[PDB]
Amino acid sequence: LSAIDMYGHQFCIENLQKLILSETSIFDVLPNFFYHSNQVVRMAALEVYVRRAYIAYELNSVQHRQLKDNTCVVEFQF
Amino acid sequence: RPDTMLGVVCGALHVADVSLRNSVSNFLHSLERGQVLPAHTLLNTVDVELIYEGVKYVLKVTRQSPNSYVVIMNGSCVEVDVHLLLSYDGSSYTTYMKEEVDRYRITIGNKTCVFEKEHTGSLPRIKLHRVFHYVLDNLVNVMNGYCLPDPFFSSKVKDWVERLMKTLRDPSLPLLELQDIMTSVSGRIPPNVEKSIKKEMAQYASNITSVLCQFPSQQIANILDSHAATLNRKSEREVFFMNTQSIVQLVQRYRSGIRGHMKAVVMDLLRQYLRVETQFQNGHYDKCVFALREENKSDMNTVLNYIFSHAQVTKKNLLVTMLIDQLCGRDPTLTDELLNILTELTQLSKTTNAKVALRARQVLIASHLPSYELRHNQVESIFLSAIDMYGHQFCIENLQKLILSETSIFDVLPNFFYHSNQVVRMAALEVYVRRAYIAYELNSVQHRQLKDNTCVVEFQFMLPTSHCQRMGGMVSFRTFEDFVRIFDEVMGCFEPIHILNVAIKTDCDIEDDRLAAMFREFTQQNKATLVDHGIRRLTFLVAQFPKFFTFRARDKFEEDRIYRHLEPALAFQLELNRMRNFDLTAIPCANHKMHLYLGAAKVEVGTEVTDYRFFVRAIIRHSEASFEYLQNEGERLLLEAMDELEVAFNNTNVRTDCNHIFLNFVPTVIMDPSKIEESVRSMVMRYGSRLWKLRVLQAELKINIRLTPTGKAIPIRLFLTNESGYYLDISLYKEVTAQIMFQAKQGPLHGMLINTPYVTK
């Protein structure tokens, strides 16, 4: 929460590298917030989960959509 | 041979220096002869006007500090110092002066230059240890009351004071002064005491920036104390004497900290000012000068610096307020010795010494309760904490504590409806809505949410007879530019029946003219707003009381002047229709609470206006204590207001006679009516001649008060009545129901309703 911009950028790629080269497993609490009330923590947490899923394959594009109001969407492309 | 501008310099300050000292010697004539000369004759300012080659040189010269003389070109300031020794830009020079009846003849060594006496420019002719000592001493010579060369002071001291206070908090001071002093008395030295001092200055230096760093005062003193203990019998101790003193007064300042100084130096300096100008005031200038004269009849020079000082009291006096003010920047738990001086300070009894007293009280209360940006941090807590932060978002009971807040909260709350958490965003923002249009009835409000960068609120209400239904829009924004590029969605998602107020940031600045003029010219450049089915109203709200920018025109003139800095739904309650038989011009003014209008009696085409009254209309909500506080704030407002009304005279003059004061007290005190009547008596009585110069004859207040036995707030429109003469009538009524009704004694013009337009002669 400290790291995240919480502007539209939400550019924590270096912190994302701490997430992806974490000795510590972060599937524990991360789920507790990727459904928090906070559009930013939603977006960030959810796509990092994607990335942590498909670390094996090559991801060439991922865009979040945000529809009607109550749905948070991430896009995969690989 | 010489350089012209040097010529002007050495001219101006040679004639000056001679004249200034002579003026002193003229005083010494008068003082041996027991003559009470007017202060002015001591002649700081020396006005030399010297035309070389057609261009006149226009000058004044004011001695600024015992070393320092200031040459003033058309209100410029260049500072040199003397003893004949001259100090200039480059170096030290030698000048000789021949003066004539009407020519000014300067010889600079073997060289002569001659000027006849028969524009706009300034000269650029221009570490913490000396910046400190130097600047402090210069200001205390300034501020013992010498006088002042130009306007720049009210700025100059402000910068100066921050360098002092700031370099005085900086705990590298004792280091910089104990380095520099113990280096400059490095010899004559006993190494026990030298290895002690040099070690411990060095690890004050190493241990500075520690959380727990205090000066080792007791330690240095004790070492000195023990080997003074064994040098005591000796009586070969005058080297030791001048090191044990040079060390003991430096260490003596530093036991109680940087606020060892903030107490000591400023408190003393305060009593310096205090004592001087308190002995100064006991009756009137002449008689007081004879009592001053006679307490020290033989000499008058210390007194003359005193007399010289109270000529420019307000300079001293304002800056005294500055000093206390930033002291109160760090007061909140001060001390007995100080509060003692403060109760001494309240007794001060003269028109000139009128700020310090109000300062004494304002300090003593704001001491009891913070009301500035630090408590803006406290409100950060109250507001954000008070929010519920869910789809509930219910804080209606808290909204009534906002609406029954002793503290006025239209000030800081606007600063928060653009924070960064969308639910609390929503909550805080709608509470702002509710607090804007609480006057009319709101029957529907939907939060909107657009694209990503705009938060929109909707209003839904109707007209209670102001002049059927309408909606509204609020938007929270970061810069005006974005506002004009995010233009297209605000009217994108919008008889115009919409109210539109837009919140912007960027904290408007010096260019008020081009500022709002630009804003208005946003409307006239793009009437595109008009093309989108028209907008009833456009208020731009710029945050910091946020400065409002009222643009009323569905089909009207671009920009509204009576209500600038104000929102007209809540503003209407200043019953401003009670002067429709008048022509009033909104003048922008400090104390912006206080909107003062100059009134010309509105008449029909058949006739030309007969009345020309100054109106000053305020609004009151500045946060037993409250009632007295109310009075004190009123007094402060009165002095600023009379500054403003002075500007009003200068700007436009019509020589008003029966000036009006309109006061809307929005707090809710608990008090009795007749001690209120004595208190206001004491106020109005306390101020005498000043009232008669402006010849203010009419004052109106209202004030909601309550009584905690009922805990029930009633309004009491008190109207004040005073005519020619200092004879004063207080009119108290009651407000009775449906159009409210003044009902009492017997008072002339007893019983009428409230929206009574003002009688025109």
mmCIF file of C-alpha atoms in Angstrom, chain A residues 37 39 69, chain B residues 389 422 449:
data_model
loop_
_atom_site.group_PDB
_atom_site.id
_atom_site.type_symbol
_atom_site.label_atom_id
_atom_site.label_comp_id
_atom_site.label_asym_id
_atom_site.label_seq_id
_atom_site.Cartn_x
_atom_site.Cartn_y
_atom_site.Cartn_z
ATOM 1 C CA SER A 37 -12.648 -1.866 -1.485
ATOM 2 C CA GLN A 39 -9.701 0.129 -6.986
ATOM 3 C CA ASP A 69 -19.220 -0.537 -12.335
ATOM 4 C CA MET B 389 -16.180 4.621 4.839
ATOM 5 C CA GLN B 422 -12.986 7.006 -3.265
ATOM 6 C CA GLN B 449 -18.309 8.885 -10.968
#
